[PDB]
Amino acid sequence: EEAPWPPPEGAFVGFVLSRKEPMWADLLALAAARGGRVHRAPEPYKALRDLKEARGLLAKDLSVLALREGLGLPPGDDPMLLAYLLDPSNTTPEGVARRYGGEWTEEAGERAALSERLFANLWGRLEGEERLLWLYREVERPLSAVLAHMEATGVRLDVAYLRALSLEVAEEIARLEAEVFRLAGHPFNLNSRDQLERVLFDELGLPAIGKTEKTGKRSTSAAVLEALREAHPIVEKILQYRELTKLKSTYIDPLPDLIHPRTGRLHTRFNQTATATGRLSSSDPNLQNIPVRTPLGQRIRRAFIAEEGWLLVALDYSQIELRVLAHLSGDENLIRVFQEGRDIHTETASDPLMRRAAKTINFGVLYGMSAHRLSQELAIPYEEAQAFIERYFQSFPKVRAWIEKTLEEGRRRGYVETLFGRRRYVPDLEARVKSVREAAERMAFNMPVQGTAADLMKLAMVKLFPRLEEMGARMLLQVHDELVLEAPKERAEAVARLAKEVMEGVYPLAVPLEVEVGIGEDWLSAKE
DNA sequence: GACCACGGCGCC
DNA sequence: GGGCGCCGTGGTC
Numbered sequence: 001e002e003a004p005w006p007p008p009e010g011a012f013v014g015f016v017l018s019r020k021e022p023m024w025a026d027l028l029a030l031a032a033a034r035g036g037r038v039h040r041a042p043e044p045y046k047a048l049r050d051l052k053e054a055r056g057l058l059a060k061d062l063s064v065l066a067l068r069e070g071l072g073l074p075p076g077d078d079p080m081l082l083a084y085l086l087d088p089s090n091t092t093p094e095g096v097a098r099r100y101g102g103e104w105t106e107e108a109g110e111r112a113a114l115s116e117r118l119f120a121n122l123w124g125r126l127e128g129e130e131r132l133l134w135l136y137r138e139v140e141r142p143l144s145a146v147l148a149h150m151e152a153t154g155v156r157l158d159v160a161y162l163r164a165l166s167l168e169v170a171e172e173i174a175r176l177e178a179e180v181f182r183l184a185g186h187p188f189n190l191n192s193r194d195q196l197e198r199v200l201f202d203e204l205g206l207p208a209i210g211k212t213e214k215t216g217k218r219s220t221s222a223a224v225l226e227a228l229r230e231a232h233p234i235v236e237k238i239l240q241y242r243e244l245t246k247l248k249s250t251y252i253d254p255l256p257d258l259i260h261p262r263t264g265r266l267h268t269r270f271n272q273t274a275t276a277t278g279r280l281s282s283s284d285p286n287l288q289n290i291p292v293r294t295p296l297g298q299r300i301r302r303a304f305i306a307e308e309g310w311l312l313v314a315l316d317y318s319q320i321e322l323r324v325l326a327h328l329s330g331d332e333n334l335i336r337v338f339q340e341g342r343d344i345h346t347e348t349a350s351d352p353l354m355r356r357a358a359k360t361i362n363f364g365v366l367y368g369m370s371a372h373r374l375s376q377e378l379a380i381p382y383e384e385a386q387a388f389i390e391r392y393f394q395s396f397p398k399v400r401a402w403i404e405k406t407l408e409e410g411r412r413r414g415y416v417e418t419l420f421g422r423r424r425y426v427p428d429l430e431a432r433v434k435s436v437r438e439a440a441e442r443m444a445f446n447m448p449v450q451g452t453a454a455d456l457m458k459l460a461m462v463k464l465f466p467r468l469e470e471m472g473a474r475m476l477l478q479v480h481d482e483l484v485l486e487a488p489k490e491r492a493e494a495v496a497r498l499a500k501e502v503m504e505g506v507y508p509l510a511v512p513l514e515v516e517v518g519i520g521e522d523w524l525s526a527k528e
Numbered sequence: 529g530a531c532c533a534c535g536g537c538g539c540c
Numbered sequence: 541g542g543g544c545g546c547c548g549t550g551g552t553c
């Protein structure tokens with residue numbers, strides 16, 4: 001039943017944007033649904049001034065757009081989060097809708113009505129889900145607001161810097177491709193893997209080390225190519241071209257084009273329901289994968305700067321995953337090396353050369369790397385490799401024990417979970433194909449650690465944001481086990497110290513949570 | 529122009 | 541080799 005725009009309080013929104021990014025979208029339509037009536041706003045924008053909060057599907061998004069228009073409108077209940085927690089594979093409105101009672105259409109009114117209806121069913125399904133309900137009420141919902149503020153804020157970028165970088169890299173790529181072409185004895189599209197495969201394996205005589213997955217073609221991966229670096233002198237030239245071209249096309253060239261007019265900052269999206277483990281995801285500008293490994297990568301990182309008069313504050317948990325594993329495992333020995341405070345790697349071993357061998361087996365257990373994978377990972381083949389791990393599970397019995405327990409529970413229950421009860425169903429755990437089953441197994445015992453580490457971070461963000469706001473500081477980015485903040489120079493140290501303390505004691509476990517902090521005028525300098 | 533599958537690769 | 545998202549290349553509509 002259609003009723004005049006002003007909806008009663010507690011209504012469920014329903015809006016249509018001209019595009020996916022709320023920071024670039026136009027509010028084409030806005031509607032609300034309550035009880036049984038449906039109210040449409042004749043003027044969406046002015047309408048927003050009537051809502052006290054965004055209640056409904058993708059609330060945060062409409063909330064982001066409200067913020068960009070100077071409206072405090074906070075996001076509230078959002079069935080997507082409910083569905084997401086019930087099943088982490090619930091990632092789109094299209095799917096949750098079809099799966100729980102509706103159709104994701106393009107009408108603001110039907111979307112609003114869809115929101116209400118969807119929330120009822122989903123909420124009901126959360127019956128007796130004390131843990132899931134806890135994650136919704138105490139983490140998911142409240143965090144949805146932190147994210148809206150994060151996206152609205154944005155991060156300052158050195159646009160003239162990257163532009164200068166572009167021309168310079170362009171010339172280096174040209175010298176590189178010019179060189180490989182002379183080595184192949186002729187040019188070709190070096191961006192074409194198919195064309196490069198023929199040059200490497202077909203035309204030249206380089207041994208094809210591996211084949212692709214879906215198409216089964218001879219691969220030209222960096223791995224295949226790193227091994228072939230000794231053969232032809234073209235291999236290296238190709239390897240640098242790839243890096244350069246990867247960095248230019250992905251960061252140096254598109255980023256400056258994404259700056260916002262009204263802000264002059266990069267406004268990335270922080271998707272709350274796009275991962276199977278419970279991790280967050282950054283899209284459109286994906287600011288969760290900015291380079292940092294190679295020199296040129298670092299030159300790019302320096303491009304992310306703080307407002308004039310502010311400082312960047314980067315905080316990273318220290319191997320939060322190995323720690324969550326110690327807690328999850330309850331492995332005295334592991335929980336002891338952290339307690340305490342001995343170099344995980346160093347202490348594990350109990351040299352240098354070996355320390356690069358005792359940290360890999362400790363972290364490679366997060367996916368259970370194969371002995372053949374380790375043989376080629378280290379020096380000693382699958383002979384001493386399998387052994388150079390026989391002590392891992394021999395030193396850390398409960399870990400291997402835990403991995404076993406989680407899996408069995410996974411086969412029986414049909415899903416696995418995090419310290420807080422976040423769950424993920426891994427059906428292929430009972431598959432008849434070794435190949436697929438052991439693949440599910442790796443996703444299976446990995447989820448708890450990755451998901452627990454995420455729950456912890458999401459909770460840290462939830463508690464830290466308010467204090468930050470009270471301090472005049474801001475949360476800019478999150479990169480899974482780290483956060484990037486922005487604070488006035490006069491408060492940077494006080495903000496760093498606080499965030500660090502908040503993050504470290506977010507949720508005490510058998511082992512301490514260690515956080516390293518850094519301040520600087522740019523991301524690289526803040527020591528990210 | 530918009531979008532797809534795929535190989536490849538950036539980060540956690 | 542666990543979790544993502546983005547970029548060209550080829551090829552579709």
Ligand SMILES: Nc1ccn([C@H]2CC[C@@H](COP(=O)(O)OP(=O)(O)OP(=O)(O)O)O2)c(=O)n1
Pocket residue numbers: 316317318319320321366480481540542
């Ligand atoms: N190559 C990697 C790196 C990280 N991770 C996961 C497990 C650890 C978590 C955070 O990664 P980093 O921040 O890179 O490492 P860290 O060990 O947590 O901490 P530090 O910053 O001291 O390296 O993400 C992963 O799966 N694969």
Ligand SMILES: [Mg+2]
Pocket residue numbers: 316317318319481482
């Ligand atoms: Mg870290």
